[PDB]
Amino acid sequence: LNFTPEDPAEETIPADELHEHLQKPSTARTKRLKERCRWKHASAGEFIEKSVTAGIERMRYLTEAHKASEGKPEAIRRALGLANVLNKSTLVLQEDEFIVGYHAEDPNMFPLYPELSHMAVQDYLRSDYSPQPADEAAAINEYWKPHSLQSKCQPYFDPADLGRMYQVSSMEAPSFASGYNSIVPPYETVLEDGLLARIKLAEKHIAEAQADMSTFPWNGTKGLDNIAKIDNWKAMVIACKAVISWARRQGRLCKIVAENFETDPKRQAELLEIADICQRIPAEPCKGLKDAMQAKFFTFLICHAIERYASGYAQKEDTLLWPYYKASVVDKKFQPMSHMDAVELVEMERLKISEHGAGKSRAYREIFPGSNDLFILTVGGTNAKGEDACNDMTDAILEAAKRIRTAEPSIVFRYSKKNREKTLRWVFECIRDGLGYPSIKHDEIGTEQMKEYAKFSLNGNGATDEEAHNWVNVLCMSPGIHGRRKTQKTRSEGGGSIFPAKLLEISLNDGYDWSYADMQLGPKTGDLSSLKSFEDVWEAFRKQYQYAINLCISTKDVSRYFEQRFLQMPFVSAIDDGCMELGMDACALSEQPNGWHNPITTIVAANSLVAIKKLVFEEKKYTLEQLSQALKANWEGFEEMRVDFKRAPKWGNDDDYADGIITRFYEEIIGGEMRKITNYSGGPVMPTGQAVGLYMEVGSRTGPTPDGRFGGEAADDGGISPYMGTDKKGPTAVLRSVSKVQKLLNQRLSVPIMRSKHGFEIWNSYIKTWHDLNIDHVQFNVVSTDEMRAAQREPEKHHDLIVRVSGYSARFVDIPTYGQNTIIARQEQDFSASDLEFLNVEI
Amino acid sequence: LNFTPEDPAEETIPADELHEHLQKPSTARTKRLKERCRWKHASAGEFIEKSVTAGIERMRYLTEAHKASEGKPEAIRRALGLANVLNKSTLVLQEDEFIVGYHAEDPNMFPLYPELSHMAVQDYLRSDYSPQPADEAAAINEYWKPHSLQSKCQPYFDPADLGRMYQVSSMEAPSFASGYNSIVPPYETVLEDGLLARIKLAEKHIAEAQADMSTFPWNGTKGLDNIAKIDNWKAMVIACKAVISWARRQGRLCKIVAENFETDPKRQAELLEIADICQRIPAEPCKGLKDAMQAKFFTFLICHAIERYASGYAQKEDTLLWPYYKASVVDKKFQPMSHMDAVELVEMERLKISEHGAGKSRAYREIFPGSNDLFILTVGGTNAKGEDACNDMTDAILEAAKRIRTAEPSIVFRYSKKNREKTLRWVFECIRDGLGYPSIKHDEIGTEQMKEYAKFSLNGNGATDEEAHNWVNVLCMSPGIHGRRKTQKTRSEGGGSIFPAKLLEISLNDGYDWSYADMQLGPKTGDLSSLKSFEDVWEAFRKQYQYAINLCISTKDVSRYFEQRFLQMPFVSAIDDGCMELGMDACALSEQPNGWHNPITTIVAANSLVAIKKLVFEEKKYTLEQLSQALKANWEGFEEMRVDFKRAPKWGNDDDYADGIITRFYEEIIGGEMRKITNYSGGPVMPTGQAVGLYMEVGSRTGPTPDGRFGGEAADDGGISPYMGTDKKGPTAVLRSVSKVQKLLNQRLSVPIMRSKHGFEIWNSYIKTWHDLNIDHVQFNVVSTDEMRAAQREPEKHHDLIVRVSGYSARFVDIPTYGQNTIIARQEQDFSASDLEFLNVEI
Amino acid sequence: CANFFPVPKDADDYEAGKADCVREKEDEKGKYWLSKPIFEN
Amino acid sequence: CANFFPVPKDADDYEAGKADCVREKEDEKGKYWLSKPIFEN
């Protein structure tokens, strides 16, 4: 009944600086490593650390190799490109590091990608972070321009349509234009088999293919199939051999420094251990946890930075590292460790990620203020038999997060009722410390979505019912298979956003966006006078949505077409059992379909339509001309009219008239018309109820809407979360509203009840109810307003304060004042006795 | 009964200079044009005319365009390559010319092809005919090396195997290594439709494809198919627009010269007519014969020289030009002409071809001494209804050949009993003048071979029963569909040679060629001791043949693979109804299969095997070691042994023991094992009983054989023709021998009986019998030995003496003394009373 | 022998300052003319 | 700070006259080392 802090030490600690006393690094080493951490996060279009700038070695060595590889098969050229980069790159070794490696010539730098988007590199050339020398980089960007993925996709689209997508108002810009990307790396293959084994497999396949081509009698209708296979397998060998050499040259650096530079005998012996690890790994199979963690990081560098840029950190880390945690900690067969040693190791991993400079474009640094890049790993969930997957490696991951307190990487916890309590308590510890993560995903919901997509497999080799349990978050919102095979290899497969709120706004202006772009954003579906009935505004929005979603998916498939032809990824292909077996490129082979796309600001356009039908066509209180006049005036006049449109029946009020329209709006237009589209993998394109921080930007990109919003008033709280200051029936009612959609939840909990000894039981009771209501996602914010206000006044005393923005976490002081005030304004929800009965609690 | 010359003027003309009084140009213009003809034929690795050398403009402008077209689709890059060549090329206009145009910057020159074979261009760089400047050309050849067709095909073959093919002893070198090529141009489309119409078709298809890609709902499993189509159609437009501009710039040259340079008012008015023709043609449909002849030549230049090198002149010229002959001569609707005007026009065509410098490699100038290139056109035959196809255009073609007396182009006459006598007499006139052409092909045999191949069509759109009558000789020996569609586009489809005589020789030496290459030419099938029975030498040759033929076809299909991917021919594609309809490249789309390959020196290896079975394994007179010793000694010793092996039962002697082996040798090994191979077009690879002058070279490349031959004694008279000095039962017996093979005939006729008034009846009677014996091919040589001897003594007095070498005709004085003596030595066959009864003659 | 002939503005290959360089030549065989596209020297 | 370290003859990346140029650096954050492949100056 009493909400005293579980730790008596917090009784004396001022509430406006609580989170400045929560961090507790497992060792002195990780304490030093956090203090001297080379942060790469940025704010207001500017990096927080002063030394952060772009490198040029990748651009240089990729260009050199490309010129020299003319005439050769593109797959091999790409392998030779990666090889040249790895062979000639300056390697980096820092002090106190155990997990070593980097993706640039300088630890403060980040590589660029002229082979992707010409515009993206151009923007860095015109910035304070341009690669040096600036003239050489400019020459490199000009050389790559006709070979860029952007230049290959553009001719097959009306330049007028592309301009509409480049506005980023109704449609997100295509990935070939931005260079943005995601991937789920087959880490399991590297750790289990090693790269030498993959080379031997490829070499054997080549000899078999060559033997077939010289086999009498020849068949020209079949024999020529070996050409693409041999080219792919040869590229895999080149790529793998380069990574091994690159990892061993990294180890040689450790040996050199330990023998010629390092003065501390403790560090010297440590660097020699790291040298032995880099020597064997990833050439040989991993035998211990230290090997596994190093392999995983090496593999991460190649797949997400060196071979190609790919935002994300998708992996099932606990399940992935468990066999090596077991060999090291549990059985102590190789590299004997304690549980705390594992905790320190994960701490060091989080720091390496915190130092990972992302060569992403500027446009994708604005949508996520105060962050480096979106790094989201997944833990928990269930195994193949539906049994609990949680283990001590899971706990080690979670404890390290709580201890080191870094905003990145974020964590997704797949919640099942099978999940043991001991792990759940660790989940709660991170949340109660206001980290914003682990966010909670519905285990069964995601598993079923893997089974559904598996049916559309072109080669009939989708994920089995057992393999469906092996899923992770690709980025912030969407599920995806992990493992040695059938993993998503590109953002072209799944990802991207569409904004129905913008589609509706232009639907009342003949496809013309007057508020933001000041141009024709959609097709001329008709003027206000042509629209004589509510059925016409329903078809006006339909054609706007159809036209928009068609461009969104077509641009990704066209990108996919040229990605497998000119942007081959022979390394990723080498560590995929499917690609290695069939001799195909990672982008070419797509065994497990996963075509998602994100409808953001859907509820905003949904509520607006209800107010239109009733006030304009049913009651005839206002004509479409007056409403359009009221919008274009940004509610300067028509104040009694504005409050009347907000008064109109909304979503989440159990209103038959309102809910009856939204239901028909989601299953027929938003989800119906979208399901009609088939992507590259032969599967349907299904919606994702979520908002990846776009709402803050898009909300400023969308005009005033008949839901009561002014011009630029941003936004929807989440992808399905209720509008700010609209939920007036408690936190339990928010659970009632989201659960209605069956064909992302942001919540703020009170600090005192969470820092108490009764905190876990209340939180767990909420989660169990949340799971029973079949809600897909939920994240929690545990931070007092006073501490945020104190962080605004004296930022230099609140560096370790971490808050949850959207789909990611960030340091509150590294967020612009405009962004801070937006997060603060949100009301902290409390639980009543009626709510507790609904959650079926038991104290 | 009396063999007096039909022309009393020949009674006084000395027999040793008869053919120096046969030429009779229709006009003074063509008489001048033959006298000042810029001949391009070569002898002993040296051009006859002194000014003949290679150009560089094509190499230069193709290289410039390729550098500038980086990143673009290969089909479009190839179109831009052709465009740049056509746009910037120096155009040539000569005096007395009516048919205008050229394929180089200088009328004495010929372009080169670095995009094909690096070695071929390299050989010209190391010659007295290197393109100038030599350093720039060397830089151009080095740039193209990794992009060359040769460099793209080589990695997919054992370098040891390629070296065996490069020896040109048992296998002909692959086309990607030599650059040699053939094509059957769809002339019908150009003349009937014009290029502007083809552009409009392509543009319409593009708009339809673009409309489909933006059609809701999108389908990524289908929609991406439009990419390759749009790229192809765009390339067709670029290519066509360039040819039109190129032809009109050619016309502008005529106008300029007529207005500023030409002083003769007759020629001025003529050049203005040519200017009007080039302006409309081939942009617009042809309306007259002059338009048609100009279109055909323009189209020939692009398809055989400018867009790509392609040896040959395949076309059904009489049937092709007939509608325009009819409009001009017969109906006089447009460009009114007399029959003689048509004769003069064809005369001028033969001269333009005689001036056409071929950029073919040196290696293919040695096999055909005294010739420019193999230009073979086809006339006669039957139409779709099996009725006679002969017309007055046929006669005009034949008369022009007799009048102008040029060695090139050669003519193939498809003989049917439906063929009218008036045309047959014109055929006889060319033969009786000793031109060596028209050679005679069996009409029905070729037509049936088109029906058979039609069944294996991958898209089920092979030649119909009516379309099967529309066939021509691709080169010297093989039949192929002509028309607006389904025509052969590359030598990769059909062509190439294999030499069983060499396969047998190395079969008795463990696959080692000791006589020529002095290296391991085949697989180690076993030594002489391992071979204990005749069944072993039959399997030894089998494995040698299987290994050889497999490389022959695989190398062509691999070439085909990269030809459609990097060597696209957008112009040829544009004038093909199939390619235009399906949006595919000419090399990609293969509707009518035509996979042939040439077994040369088959009879030599056939006869040798009979002598082996009987003398070594049946009678045990000599062991395999003694026979091998006799061969390696080149019959220095074992003279009684040599005459004994020649004494052994041969082919064509009606010997049951001999014919029983050859029959089993042809249907099981030569044709059986070869039919087992399927090529790119999904059809079988069937043999061609013929010899395209290779026997003179290969005969010097093959060692002594157990058929009685010494080392280097060359060779087989033809592809199925009996060995020289072996036919001892008359010319009728030669007809008996060839007709045995059902699962090329060279003949020499006596001058006096052919120059008489009874010549035609005897010749016609022979042809009718030849047709009934189902013999595929036959050519005739009508020239006295005395005239050839007189040509050797005083060559400057016998310039117009033309003889038949192999599959082509050449001037006797332009043939090396070694080559001359080979043709002279052949015995002139005479017809007895017994032969006349067998031919069913009637005087 | 170099004579400049400006390309007509209605020609398919017309470009700014483009012209045909027509030169008359004659060897032992006969007379001929060469037309090379040049851009205002 | 430029120190040349010859690449061992048994290394995967071994080439003639190849060496690692190891240089020690240190900014406001901390100390680190850079290894750049160089070919005998």
Ligand SMILES: [Cl-]
């Ligand atoms: Cl996602």
Ligand SMILES: [Cl-]
């Ligand atoms: Cl042929």
